[PDB]
Design a protein around this ligand. Sequence first.
Ligand code: HEA
Ligand code: HEA
Ligand SMILES: [Cu+2]
Lengths: 55, 236, 59, 534, 102, 47, 45, 77, 269
Amino acid sequence: TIAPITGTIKRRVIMDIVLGFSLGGVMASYWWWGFHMDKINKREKFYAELAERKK
Amino acid sequence: DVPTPYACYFQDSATPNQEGILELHDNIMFYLLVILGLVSWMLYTIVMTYSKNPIAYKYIKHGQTIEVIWTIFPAVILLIIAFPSFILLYLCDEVISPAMTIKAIGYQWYWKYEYSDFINDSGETVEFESYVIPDELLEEGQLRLLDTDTSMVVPVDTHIRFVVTAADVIHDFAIPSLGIKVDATPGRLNQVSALIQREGVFYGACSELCGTGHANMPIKIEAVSLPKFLEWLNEQ
Amino acid sequence: ANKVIQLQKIFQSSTKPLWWRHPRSALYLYPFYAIFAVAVVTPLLYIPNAIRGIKAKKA
Amino acid sequence: MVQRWLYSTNAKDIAVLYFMLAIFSGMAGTAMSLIIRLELAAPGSQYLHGNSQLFNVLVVGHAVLMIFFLVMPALIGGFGNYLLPLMIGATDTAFPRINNIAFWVLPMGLVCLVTSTLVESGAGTGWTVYPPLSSIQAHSGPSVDLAIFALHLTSISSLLGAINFIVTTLNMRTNGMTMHKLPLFVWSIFITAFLLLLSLPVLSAGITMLLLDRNFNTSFFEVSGGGDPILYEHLFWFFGHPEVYILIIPGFGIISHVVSTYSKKPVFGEISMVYAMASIGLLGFLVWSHHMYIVGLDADTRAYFTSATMIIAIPTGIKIFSWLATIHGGSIRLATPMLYAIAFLFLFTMGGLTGVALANASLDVAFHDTYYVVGHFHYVLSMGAIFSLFAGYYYWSPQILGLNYNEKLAQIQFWLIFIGANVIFFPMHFLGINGMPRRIPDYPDAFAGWNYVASIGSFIATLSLFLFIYILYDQLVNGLNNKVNNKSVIYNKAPDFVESNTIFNLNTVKSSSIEFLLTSPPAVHSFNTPAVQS
Amino acid sequence: DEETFEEFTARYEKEFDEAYDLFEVQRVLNNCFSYDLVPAPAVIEKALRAARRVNDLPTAIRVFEALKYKVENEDQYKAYLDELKDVRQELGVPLKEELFPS
Amino acid sequence: VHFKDGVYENIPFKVKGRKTPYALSHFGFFAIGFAVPFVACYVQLKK
Amino acid sequence: GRIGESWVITEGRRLIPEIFQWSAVLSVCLGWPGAVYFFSKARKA
Amino acid sequence: SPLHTVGFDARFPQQNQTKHCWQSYVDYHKCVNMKGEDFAPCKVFWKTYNALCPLDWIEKWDDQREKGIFAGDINSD
Amino acid sequence: MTHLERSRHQQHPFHMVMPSPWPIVVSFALLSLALSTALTMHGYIGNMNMVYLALFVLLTSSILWFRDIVAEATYLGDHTMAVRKGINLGFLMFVLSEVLIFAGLFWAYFHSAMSPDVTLGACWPPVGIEAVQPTELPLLNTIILLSSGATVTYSHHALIAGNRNKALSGLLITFWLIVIFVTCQYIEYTNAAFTISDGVYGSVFYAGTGLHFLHMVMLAAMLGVNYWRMRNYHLTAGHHVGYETTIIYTHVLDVIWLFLYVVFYWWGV
Ligand code: HEA
Ligand code: HEA
Ligand SMILES: [Cu+2]
């Protein structure tokens, strides 16, 4: 007999979309972590090979 | 360089322009990935939740909050994915002293590159063709369907311009590794300043149909140092 | 004029095709297409019959 | 049959001819594209011993048949002239002679292309006809001329269809319907007709100019005299960009209709729907030169064009969110049209966002005229043309003809074709992103495995299509036996979960389109009294 | 979205008042469940009164099942318990204890 | 035009007749569909 | 009177199986190309 | 080039330099074909056409001057 | 009786058309024209008379359909306000597509305003490219065309108002002016400005002028058909489905000619 109803109009879609956005962002960050490690490793290798032969 | 087999990402970078293109690509693809994840999960949860729903909420039409939310979010998302493209275009298109200039004409199913910036013996203009070696007459140890008898050379740690044109049909100067891709108009020239910071051999084929025999379009770019470039020029 | 109303009345009385205006023109034009276009499209594939068969096989 | 069919003047009796030509052309084109993929499986002349001109000609035939002769004749005309007059309620559309002359001008294009491939000349310059490669300088013979007349006749038929659509929907629309209560598919076809009208003449003029240059010993775009093909590329892309929207928008309409009729809930802002569609249609013209960033235009021009592209992308996202709102919070019966719609909402959206990502001004340095763009458009074409047409067929066939289809067969066909299309088109993004070029029968020795998986997927897809045509046969031969038994679903909208089944006898099918409320297809000149809405 | 319960409530009872047969009962109940407004015990009692007027016990069973499962509402039970027991023992429509163990 | 009941009259087929039990028609449709790629391949090269 | 939920308990017990299933579906849909890569002689195995 | 020719470029703020070679070549051809004694007035943009401009344009213009039909719009001197 | 037939033929402005062979025959004519042209310009047989007869019969079929589209409007009638509005809107969209054709012709060379390109042109005005310019050469005819259109637009307004001897005078004036225009068009048959060998700048202008020389022929054909009909007096001052078409055509062609004369003549010179 809880009088306050009609509160389920919008919070469902809001929680759904916010959870989806959070899941997408966290999966993107997890994927990009290793790719960024690879990118920085390759950049370090490029700098090392570019500077090591000159000196 | 060589297209790595079974690859699922971009080729090895050779120039700061190409690596900047790669940076813009991954920055864009990050937000594209989050958007696609959002929409895919929304689809999945909708179909896996409301498939069993007995009675449908058929009197919901307005949704002002979500309306304003996804009306204002795409604007800033597009602005933040477009700003890096603008800044990368500004940085890369900067014509910062292209130190080398060579001809690159797309002929009928072959290329005849003419080097006029430099000379060979005394003032003469160096020019030669680039013919793809036939598959049947292949020499052992080469790359099939692409390798040429003679190719082009280029100094490293310098700036280069590829003057692109055509003779009868439009060609394409497609070198993804070197980050240059400009059409070959029949009569109209185009200037692109390619600066290379990494040594190596960069491959390439024309990304434009040339009629019938376009299956073999040899564009091989070989990077050499200044003394090696001088030796090649003296030999040529 | 003096023939519109009679013509409409006769056409309504005789609900027939060809619209009564150009029967001779229709009878003249009907065989011409068959005589001309068919006989001009037949060579298009009849002549290259000996030309056809270019295998161009290489090995 | 000649007395009523070959001499037909009825829109309903000619929509089925539209469908028959569409399905035959699709089966032939799928067979030839099957071949095209089959010589692409391994490097070398596995099946095409030399003669790359044949490979190019087959590619051109595939592209042209799917674009102009397969689906544009199918969803624009065939669905339009069978629904729009039927949904309006008018007995007959104005001047069915227009529809008949539009239809009958198709097949000679097919025969002229087949003989153009037959002759040694061939049209092997791509489905784009960029000069001078299609002129007497490179390609002699009649192949170019036959292709030009084929596109001319297809454009004429499209113009006639658009004329009929506009006149029927605007001049004698039924009294009940007004501007503020008009359904969605007809709005889609109306905007499509507007874009077609504003797009056809420029193509006609430019291609007539090319024909005259090839004949009158002159050159307006060829350098032989001082011309420049950049103008022709401008004009051709100015035609081309509207064309994809022309072929895609009625898919939007039918998908919105099916999700509305299957979710048991109304649309989400039909005013917003038509706003999005009209905005897309009007905004399609701002990117006339966005497809050729490689040319070397000014930085300001590229910035304006990419801004136009990113503006264009937004209404599509609005429409996608609207579909999500329509599906959210509603009961769903997982029937096959829902399967097609969900596959659309997934793969079309992913492909479109990839294309938006590529829509950067300087990003064509990596994807343009590579396998990435083919992975781009194969996605959206397959979702909005193949899957849209499938959804429409499985959504209207039980009533427009009275014949049902085997639901299990439909489900397995959908699964087969979906997995085949995915496994075919997905690797080509990996192909392109490396930087491999396009339009070459033989390729370097790097991505053999991706081509192989594409080929096995192509075989899967053609097996799916064979199953589909077998389903067509079974429906056409076993409809009365399928209706009586439990082999198929006979009520797409199940009763609400409060309502008794005995009372459901008088509530059979009630939705937002009249053609579902009709009986078995009556005489062609039905609707003695026009429908009126209170 | 700031919509009063009382107006539509009173509409539901007044439509139940002139329920000639089960068609208007069915349509009104479906419309009531269509909103997110979880039905009040009073409107459910009025609906059961209308169902007893039209003499179709299956309507009562269906509405009881709908009340048991209409919305999650954070899985509230005792509200459902009272809203079912008051209308079961108000007059007597014994239906729940038979479909469940079958 | 109003002399058609509207059952099978919408398709240029005919159940009546031993000439084609809906097999020769479908065989011919398969044949005409497979004709254009096969003949296109055959005229200049092998299948 | 706030009977039972406490949104968190039911919300987690419903989402976590669903999220795990969805992640597994994506893992398979991206591991089948990886499955092809492994099974194919990428490293002469 | 020994990694040092100009450094920072500020001639044209906008990115695209499609209409750049004509202005940088007209002055060069005018100063070369007027006095020929001292190139000091046009001694500051040697590289703007040798390497900073497509040499195909330069050779086409030279051949055109040989044949008397110049691509650009200049006088007969 | 009256009510039932009124309802059964009111919202049905479409006749129960016979098995009209028009679609198949016109399609056959177009296909024969296409294949014959392809075989003749570059093929195996270079005969010209047969393809000329093919073009002739295609034009005869087109004229037959075009005269029917107005004969059935009066001889058969059976038209309402809605179908008249639809036919007028169809003519408007047809002339709009023609205007789009003209705009494409203009844009074929009108986008070179401030010379954005580098080579192969990009010079407005094209200094050095000075052949016999087709500009300002037919302006002596353009001005008289403007005067004729101005003096016949209101004459055709009085036509649609009364359809009387004044309308006959206006039609005769139109016949005279179109005869003068076709005469002065054919007088510049071969040597109008020049031929296309090198430097294609006025050649595109010549082609654009040439390809539009058929719309005036179509206008003259419709005027002659209406003249014959009103000589037969089938068409009174009632369902003038052709008079409205000709007045809208003459009210749009003067506008498009004015737009053509705005630029391309005094712009760049
Ligand atoms: C409808 C549009 C459509 C469809 C269905 C297809 C189907 C296929 N396409 Fe194609 N394609 C294009 C539109 C389409 N394509 C276009 C526009 C180009 C541009 C050419 C260019 O870039 O130059 C192109 C180019 C193109 C290329 C470029 C080749 C080259 O670089 O030269 C390749 C390469 O393999 C290819 C492959 C395939 C394959 C393997 C299929 C297979 O999927 C075939 C199986 C078909 C599908 C799975 C869809 C089902 C189709 C049906 C007809 C089902 C029939 C039933 C109904 C219609 C009711 N396509
Ligand atoms: C069915 C046909 C079809 C469809 C629907 C599309 C849809 C789109 N296309 Fe594509 N395209 C083609 C057919 C199609 N295209 C063809 C045939 C080519 C040429 C290939 C050839 O020449 O061989 C091509 C090429 C092409 C190019 C040039 C690449 C080339 O070289 O080929 C570009 C880039 O500008 C592009 C962009 C887009 C965009 C932005 C959409 C969009 O309309 C996509 C619509 C979907 C959405 C955008 C989803 C909504 C997005 C959101 C959910 C919002 C998220 C982002 C924001 C914040 C706004 N297309
Ligand atoms: Cu586009």
